[PDB]
Swiss-Prot record:
GO terms for cellular component: cytosol; extracellular exosome; extracellular region; ficolin-1-rich granule lumen; nucleoplasm; nucleus; tertiary granule lumen. Changing Q136A: No loss of activity. The lineage of its organism: Eukaryota, Metazoa, Chordata, Craniata, Vertebrata. Changing K565R: No effect on epoxide hydrolase and aminopeptidase activity. This is Leukotriene A-4 hydrolase. The active site is at E296 (proton acceptor), Y383 (proton donor). Belongs to the peptidase M1 family. Isoform 1 and isoform 2 are expressed in monocytes, lymphocytes, neutrophils, reticulocytes, platelets and fibroblasts. The record marks E271, G562 as: Pro-Gly-Pro binding. It comes from Homo sapiens. It is an enzyme of class 3 (hydrolase). Phosphorylation at Ser-415 inhibits leukotriene-A4 hydrolase activity. The gene is LTA4H. Changing G269A: No loss of activity.
Length: 610
């Protein structure tokens, strides 16, 4: 069974493996560089090992030290988004299982794709700068030299020097703080991660952060202006951790803290161990976007404990996490609610497949990422096709209680390891050996490796969806003389989730006639709704239906936050509207230099600019 990581230029785990990183760096805001040493404890997996190769991207290497002396190394030629391989010549050949420590002195580039450096103007407080990282999938190599593949798990410690007014946090347990001996305007924050993790989980923030406690093992961190609102928004967090522990087994990471990032954070959430990062666009005021916390919590088992061996197997991380996310929300709010969210996810899958096209290779569950940048291929597919496959399997094999038994056993089986789809499938067959005849009914080749919508759609309870579908059908089939029958009372029995689903249904049939959209604004006043998911879908419906009044609203939401879920389609829709096209491109050009580097790249590709 031969499997190597095609996104990594480092020596693979079969040659050598990193066991520990001790990181000592200083955050230089004047220069937008992180400077320090990465000491890697590396274990040879081979006899007579004399060299090894590490991933780097846009790093400046000052030197490499083993056994107190400088050693030879060479940087290869850059291999586009993969970066440049660093070969290091070991001073003494290693036997199998021998471990050494390699200390690499390095400096990042200001344009590190792992990092966003924010001026004071780009923060809430307006007095201090801010830095955050995002290493998933393959940007850890833009921060430090490493075997940048999830097929290798290491523990880590780190000492981070920062201006003394600021606070540093990491994906790790805080292990104290002191004044910096070599510069008193500074502080050193120390950190310890005792659980082996893939390098994509290394995370760093530095900024003017304050914390508030919201449960026995949870602090919320943000700038001061966001603290009170974040505490309320994420108050279900401890109750979700308890349900998750019930489903997954023991939470092993100690703390579960939340960090609410500035608005340019590119994702809804990122499951950094001990410190989940979230977008401030979750702060709807009513806890209605909390499925995102349920999702990040669930990664504490599926993803951070049982990890995909390479990114071709990313659905293992996300499809399982969505399956557990939806169970948490099902426990809190009922089984009809789990089916409603499950049925919504099928529609998001329809969208993604329609968008790439039904034979596009990114619509496959297991993807081949050789020479594909993971950020380009990134979509809802591994989430929703992965969830669809699990929910189909749940229904085939006897229901949620039985399938949840399999999930817990799966996590116990593969804790602290990195696995492939074939490892998952083999264990699925082993666990359900008394139901192999059922298992053999599944069209594995189609579910796993075929493009498009899955060969079979699961059964979904429709109770909560029906009202959404009816209202959306009323609007789609309305003629001019029917617009007067709509009224704000149409919405009185719909939850925010149902309103969001009404908009998703209607957006799938966009455009609507412009008079319909204007009437919808007259009677429902969707312009007033600040809930980001609902506002996103409503602005998209308005732009796709060619409402000029919506252009400044859509542009302002595209640029005042940077969650890619929202920014990328808003910009794409604005460019596809002839009236807003020149402005969409201009606004992108003007904002580009102060955007997140990955977001800037993808919006550029979407708009075909550069
Ligand atoms: C498209 C994008 N997706 C994410 O941010 C997900 C990232 C993730 O998988 N974290 O674990 C986390 C997530 C999971 C489920 C719902 C929303 C967000 C987004 O929502 O902005
Ligand atoms: Yb300690
Ligand atoms: Yb009529
Ligand atoms: Yb150009
Ligand atoms: Zn996830």
């Amino acid at each position: 069974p031969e499997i190597v990581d095609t996104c990594s230029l480092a020596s693979p785990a079969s040659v050598c493996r990193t066991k520990h990183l001790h990181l000592r760096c200083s955050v230089d805001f004047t220069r937008r560089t992180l400077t320090g040493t990465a000491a890697l404890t590396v274990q040879s997996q081979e006899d007579n090992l004399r060299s090894l190769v590490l991933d780097t991207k846009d790093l400046t290497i000052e030197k490499v030290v083993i056994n107190g002396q400088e050693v030879k190394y060479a940087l290869g030629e850059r291999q586009s988004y993969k970066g440049s391989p660093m070969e290091i010549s070991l001073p003494i050949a290693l036997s199998k299982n021998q471990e050494i420590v390699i200390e690499i002195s390095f400096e990042t580039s200001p344009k590190s794709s792992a990092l966003q450096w924010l001026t004071p103007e780009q923060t809430s407080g307006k007095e201090h700068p801010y830095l955050f990282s995002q290493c998933q999938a393959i940007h850890c190599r833009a921060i430090l030299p490493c075997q940048d593949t999830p097929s290798v798990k290491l523990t880590y410690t780190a000492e981070v020097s920062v201006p003394k007014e600021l606070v540093a946090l990491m994906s790790a347990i805080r292990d104290g703080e002191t004044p910096d001996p070599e510069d008193p305007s500074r502080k050193i924050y120390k950190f310890i991660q005792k659980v082996p993790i893939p390098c994509y989980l290394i995370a760093l923030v530095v900024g003017a952060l304050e914390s508030r406690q919201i449960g026995p093992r949870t602090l919320v961190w943000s700038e001061k202006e966001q603290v009170e609102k974040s505490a309320y928004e994420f108050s279900e967090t401890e109750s979700m951790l308890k349900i998750a522990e019930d489903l997954g087994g023991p939470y092993v990471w100690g703390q579960y803290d939340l960090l609410v990032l500035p608005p340019s954070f590119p994702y809804g959430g990122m499951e950094n161990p001990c410190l989940t990062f979230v977008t401030p666009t979750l702060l709807a005021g009513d806890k209605s976007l909390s499925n995102v916390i349920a999702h990040e919590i669930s990664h504490s088992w599926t993803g951070n404990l049982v990890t995909n061996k390479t990114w071709d197997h990313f659905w293992l991380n996300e499809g399982h996490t969505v399956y557990l996310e939806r169970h948490i929300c099902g426990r809190l709010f009922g089984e009809k609610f789990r089916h409603f969210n499950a049925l919504g996810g099928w529609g998001e899958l329809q969208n993604s497949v329609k968008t790439f096209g039904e034979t596009h290779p990114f619509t496959k569950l297991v993807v081949d990422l050789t020479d594909i940048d993971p950020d380009v291929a990134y979509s809802s597919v591994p989430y929703e096709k992965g969830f669809a496959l699990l929910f189909y399997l749940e229904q085939l094999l006897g229901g949620p209680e039985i399938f949840l038994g399999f999930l817990k056993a799966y996590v116990e089986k593969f804790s602290y390891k990195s696995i492939t789809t074939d490892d998952w499938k083999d264990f699925l067959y082993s666990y359900f050996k008394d139901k192999v005849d059922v298992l053999n009914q599944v069209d594995w080749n189609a579910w796993l490796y075929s493009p498009g919508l899955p060969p079979i759609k699961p059964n979904y309870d429709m109770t909560l969806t029906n009202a959404c579908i009816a209202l959306s059908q009323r609007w789609i089939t309305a003629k001019e003389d029917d617009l007067n029958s709509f009224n704000a009372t149409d919405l009185k029995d719909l939850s925010s989730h149902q309103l969001n689903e009404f908009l998703a249904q209607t957006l799938q049939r966009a455009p609507l006639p412009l008079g319909h959209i204007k009437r919808m604004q007259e009677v429902y006043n969707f312009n007033a709704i600040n809930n980001s998911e609902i506002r996103f879908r409503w602005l998209r419906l308005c732009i796709q239906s060619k409402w000029e009044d919506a252009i400044p609203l859509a542009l302002k939401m595209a640029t005042e936050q940077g969650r890619m879920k929202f920014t990328r389609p808003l910009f794409k829709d604005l460019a596809a509207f002839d009236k807003s096209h020149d402005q969409a491109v201009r606004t992108y050009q003007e904002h580009k230099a102060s955007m997140h580097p990955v977001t800037a790249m993808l919006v550029g590709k979407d708009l075909k600019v550069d």
